[PDB]
């Protein structure tokens, strides 16, 4: 019963209502608005909650799901790269997880700059990319890892671990098993890097807004939300957090599209069922 079709229908009913409520109005005070004529949102109806926005010129949000703190963002536009790199450096980012595939990044029509696999200079910021490990996630899906070193006069140099799901399938969801493996890899990578900062006495450790994993796909609402949900289920502090809670939290803190597809919700439901975690709030 707790994971039966009736419970799943009720979950979808609650979530659909929330999506509708959170739909952006014109000049919605709840959502970040572009400054002038420069494009902010990669997709016109996938907007950035203002109160949790990370930077005034990015579509990127702080999200806390239960106890689990992350940043979810869209794939930066070319015009946003310098700001995106500054975000990454100022956050002392312990892991950047990119869930857009190599083939999507290569598709010029999609406007997704290859910013983490090559080196470059973006305004005042110079970035160096180095390849590190490759970790299999299951079903032939591979996580390619990098270190991204971000340099800028007047700023401390910051190196960011990157986990790129290079062969993420382009038109299907990845399984719960792959998602679990990915969540574990992302969390572990973050823990190692965060620990380094703690060992150096970084002031970022005391700042709730910093040391957050940064996750994006293309729009930052589909694959990204599936991963963040899996990460929150991988957090030992989150006992009794329901699927309703986690998706509601993602939606209120970013936008009502978080967990964009039923296919993605199916994976979160399966993960929750495996843990005996509730779907709904009583």
UniProtKB/Swiss-Prot annotation:
EC number: 3.1.3.48
Domain Tyrosine-protein phosphatase: 1-275
Protein induction: At 37 degrees Celsius in the absence of calcium.
Active site: 217 (phosphocysteine intermediate)
Any GO CC annotation of this UniProt entry: extracellular region
GO molecular function: protein tyrosine phosphatase activity
Location of the protein in the cell: Secreted
Keywords: Hydrolase, Plasmid, Protein phosphatase, Secreted, Virulence
Catalytic activity line of the entry: O-phospho-L-tyrosyl-[protein] + H2O = L-tyrosyl-[protein] + phosphate
Cited function: Essential virulence determinant. This protein is a protein tyrosine phosphatase. The essential function of YopH in Yersinia pathogenesis is host-protein dephosphorylation. It contributes to the ability of the bacteria to resist phagocytosis by peritoneal macrophages.
Family (UniProt): Belongs to the protein-tyrosine phosphatase family. Non-receptor class subfamily.
Protein name: Tyrosine-protein phosphatase YopH
Part of the full-length chain shown: 187 to 468 of 468
